[PDB]
Amino acid sequence: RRPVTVLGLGAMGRALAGALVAAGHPTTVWNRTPGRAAALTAAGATEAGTAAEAVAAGDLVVVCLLDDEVTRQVLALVAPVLAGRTLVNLTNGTPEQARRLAEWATSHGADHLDGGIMAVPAMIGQPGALILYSGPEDVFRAGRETLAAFGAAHWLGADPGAAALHDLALLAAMYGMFGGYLHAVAMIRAAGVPATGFTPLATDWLTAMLGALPALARGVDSGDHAADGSAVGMQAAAFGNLLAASREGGVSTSLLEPVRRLLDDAVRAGHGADGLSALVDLLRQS
Amino acid sequence: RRPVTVLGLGAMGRALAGALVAAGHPTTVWNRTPGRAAALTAAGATEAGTAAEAVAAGDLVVVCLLDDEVTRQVLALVAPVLAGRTLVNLTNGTPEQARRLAEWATSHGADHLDGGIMAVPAMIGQPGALILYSGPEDVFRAGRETLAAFGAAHWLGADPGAAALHDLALLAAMYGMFGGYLHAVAMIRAAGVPATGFTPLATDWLTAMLGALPALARGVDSGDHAADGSAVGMQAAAFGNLLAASREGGVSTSLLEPVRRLLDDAVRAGHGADGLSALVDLLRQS
Numbered sequence: 155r156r157p158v159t160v161l162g163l164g165a166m167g168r169a170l171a172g173a174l175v176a177a178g179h180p181t182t183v184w185n186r187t188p189g190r191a192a193a194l195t196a197a198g199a200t201e202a203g204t205a206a207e208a209v210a211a212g213d214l215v216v217v218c219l220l221d222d223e224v225t226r227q228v229l230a231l232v233a234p235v236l237a238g239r240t241l242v243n244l245t246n247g248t249p250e251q252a253r254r255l256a257e258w259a260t261s262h263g264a265d266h267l268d269g270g271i272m273a274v275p276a277m278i279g280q281p282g283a284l285i286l287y288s289g290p291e292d293v294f295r296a297g298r299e300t301l302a303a304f305g306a307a308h309w310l311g312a313d314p315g316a317a318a319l320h321d322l323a324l325l326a327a328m329y330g331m332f333g334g335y336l337h338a339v340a341m342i343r344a345a346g347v348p349a350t351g352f353t354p355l356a357t358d359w360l361t362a363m364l365g366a367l368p369a370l371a372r373g374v375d376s377g378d379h380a381a382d383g384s385a386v387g388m389q390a391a392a393f394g395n396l397l398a399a400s401r402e403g404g405v406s407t408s409l410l411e412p413v414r415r416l417l418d419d420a421v422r423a424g425h426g427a428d429g430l431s432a433l434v435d436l437l438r439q440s
Numbered sequence: 441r442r443p444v445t446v447l448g449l450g451a452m453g454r455a456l457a458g459a460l461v462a463a464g465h466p467t468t469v470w471n472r473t474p475g476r477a478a479a480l481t482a483a484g485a486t487e488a489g490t491a492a493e494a495v496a497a498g499d500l501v502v503v504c505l506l507d508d509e510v511t512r513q514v515l516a517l518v519a520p521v522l523a524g525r526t527l528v529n530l531t532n533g534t535p536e537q538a539r540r541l542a543e544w545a546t547s548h549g550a551d552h553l554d555g556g557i558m559a560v561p562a563m564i565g566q567p568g569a570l571i572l573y574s575g576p577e578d579v580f581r582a583g584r585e586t587l588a589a590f591g592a593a594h595w596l597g598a599d600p601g602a603a604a605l606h607d608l609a610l611l612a613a614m615y616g617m618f619g620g621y622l623h624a625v626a627m628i629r630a631a632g633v634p635a636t637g638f639t640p641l642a643t644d645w646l647t648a649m650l651g652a653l654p655a656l657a658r659g660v661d662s663g664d665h666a667a668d669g670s671a672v673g674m675q676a677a678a679f680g681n682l683l684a685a686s687r688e689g690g691v692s693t694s695l696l697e698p699v700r701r702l703l704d705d706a707v708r709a710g711h712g713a714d715g716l717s718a719l720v721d722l723l724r725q726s
Contacts, residue, residue: 221681246678248685249631272645274669319631322682323624323638324645326696329679330620331649332656332716333699337616338609339660340723345535345605349657349720352609357650359558359610363617364643370618371635374625383560392532393615395507396608399534406723408698410612413619416695430618434635437626437692 156300157182159212161205161228162245163190165275167218170244170304173279174216175199177303184208186228206232209239214300215264218244222251229258237263240293242301244269244285248322249315256289256314265293268314269301270321278304288316331360333409337400344403373431380429387426390417442586443468445498447491447514448531449476451561453504456530456590459565460502461485463589470494472514492518495525500586501550504530508537515544523549526579528587530555530571534608535601542575542600551579554600555587556607564590574602617646619695623686630689659717666715673712676703 156179160171163185174181175197182200183191184207191201202208209215209232219225225245229236241259243252243266252268259266266289273283283305287294294301294309301307310316335356339349369382393414400407407414416433425432442465446457449471460467461483468486469477470493477487488494495501495518505511511531515522527545529538529552538554545552552575559569569591573580580587580595587593596602621642625635655668679700686693693700702719711718 246681248681248688250685250688276669313631315631316633318681318685319627319633320638320641322685323627324642325678325682326627326686327617327620327624327642327646328649329682329696329699330623331613331617331646333620333702334613334616335653335656336716336719337723338613339657340720341605341609341612343660343720344724345599345601347602347605349660350654352606353653353657355606356610356613357653360613360617360650361647363614364646367621367639367643368636370621371625371639374629374635383562392611395532395534395604396611396615399536399604399608400612402534402536404725406725409702409723410615412694412698413615416619430622433622434626434629437623437695438630439690439692 155180156214156297157212158300159183159202159208159215161185161208161215161217162219162224163187163194164218164220166244166271166278167216168194169275169278170216170218171199172197173303173305174300176279177300179300179303182208182211206235208232210235212239214240214242214297216242216244221245222247222255225255226258229255233262240265240267240297242267242269242297244271246271247318249313249319252288252315252318253313265290266314267293267297268317270317271304272321272324273305280305282306284308286310286317286320288312289314335360337405337409340405341400341403344405370429370431373429374434379425379432381427382429384429385427386417386420386430386432389430390414390421390426393417441466442500442583443498444586445469445488445494445501447471447494447501447503448505448510449473449480450504450506452530452557452564453502454480455561455564456502456504457485458483459589459591460586462565463586465586465589468494468497492521494518496521498525500526500528500583502528502530507531508533508541511541512544515541519548526551526553526583528553528555528583530557532557533604535599535605538574538601538604539599551576552600553579553583554603556603557590558607558610559591566591568592570594572596572603572606574598575600621646623691623695626691627686627689630691656715656717659715660720665711665718667713668715670715671713672703672706672716672718675716676700676707676712679703 158179160183184202256266270286277283288310342352444465446469470488542552556572563569574596628638
């Protein structure tokens with residue numbers, strides 16, 4: 155029943171607004187370009203003419219704009235009417251951007267919640283769509299039933315930057331997996347072997363390697379970088395054949411070279427007998 | 441009962457030889473440096489003085505040397521006594537190296553089998569240790585019971601280079617996963633968040649992303665690079681925040697930059713609306 159507002163009508167903002175109206179929430183939408191709210195209006199949404207009007211029509215203000223600069227601009231305009239409202243920043247950004255926006259919102263009499271959307275716009279509203287949230291737990295509690303219209307809502311903690319932090323961290327892990335899988339498929343493809351038949355072996359192997367993550371995490375947190383199984387120095391010695399075989403098949407090594415360098419660095423640093431947990435500190439530029 | 445020979449007594453060769461004697465196989469070992477076979481002899485192994493003597497004492501000749509050059513040298517010496525024997529190359533190498541060694545072995549009257557060891561030396565002989573094999577299926581059949589002393593034996597096909605090909609391909613996928621996870625942990629660590637509590641979220645996320653692999657494989661094999669969920673262009677637009685957030689935490693972006701470039705290349709190539717399967721061809725240097 156809680157009136158909701160969506161600022162930003164891209165693919166994601168439209169998906170968010172559509173899930174809101176389909177869950178029965180009275181939804182008022184706005185965008186810096188007209189005509190984007192046509193199917194929304196038909197389903198029962200109200201299109202406001204100004205962002206300020208949209209904000210004044212919502213107790214929960216969902217923001218899903220292009221980036222934090224756009225967000226900082228549109229919001230500075232609606233700053234006098236934020237008092238008493240809850241700002242839900244779903245705009246992709248950085249943890250520091252989130253924390254600064256949280257301070258600005260509090261200075262203007264508004265509650266603040268940040269969200270990292272882990273689902274594609276087409277999956278918004280379905281079971282399985284995941285959005286991570288961070289901010290004051292009671293702000294999350296009062297908005298949870300409304301956020302559930304988008305899908306799963308996982309609160310991570312009070313830090314306003316925690317949602318974006320875990321979002322982007324998970325993205326890094328995903329890009330690493332996919333990059334390594336894509337390289338493997340290119341190697342397989344170069345030999346004339348179908349990727350379809352290779353995928354089961356890859357999933358079994360990668361699932362097995364997921365079992366090594368708890369041991370890696372313990373070594374990182376404790377500082378004891380004990381080689382669980384393969385030490386970095388052995389893994390560095392075996393990387394050369396991977397690069398050579400990639401060259402044989404005419405496959406670029408660009409995705410793997412930075413991992414090769416990181417392993418060689420740990421060996422040069424005297425960590426050849428340690429496990430992969432010793433590579434985390436090597437990524438520090440401080 | 442089948443007499444076996446192990447050429448090369450590094451950590452892996454010693455692990456292989458130990459599993460062989462513990463399964464009851466009469467095992468004769470050799471190495472280009474003495475003193476490595478002490479515990480082997482006590483358990484019942486015979487140490488030969490020359491590689492030729494070792495080869496003449498085995499029907500199955502397991503080779504586990506430093507690299508293919510060492511392998512090509514030691515074997516050229518034992519070439520007159522390879523006739524009638526089966527050569528099992530467990531030495532880390534390339535598919536082309538394997539295929540050339542197979543031809544050399546056949547030209548000297550020997551059967552040939554190649555193996556890619558997916559287990560650390562400490563796991564050799566245990567349930568769960570995986571070694572991939574390739575070569576004539578009947579050669580694999582006659583040796584299977586002996587190879588089972590090392591652990592699981594998965595035959596991949598007749599191509600002598602297929603074992604090394606899939607071995608190194610799986611290694612590429614693993615290095616990508618770990619590199620992405622290690623970056624994520626460094627981001628988490630920089631915010632003062634424990635890696636231990638983050639790992640469950642990461643495993644759930646990565647397990648979910650394993651579900652996207654069959655769709656990626658189909659697009660690669662069929663040539664239809666349809667965006668299942670997130671198109672490359674959207675993923676490229678969101679990568680910038682990941683790089684910025686990494687910079688904020690003082691974390692290097694070296695592991696992620698090549699994936700960023702690959703995404704930007706696919707966009708510049710007009711594939712912004714395609715899925716990640718369009719990146720495989722981009723790795724071709726031909």
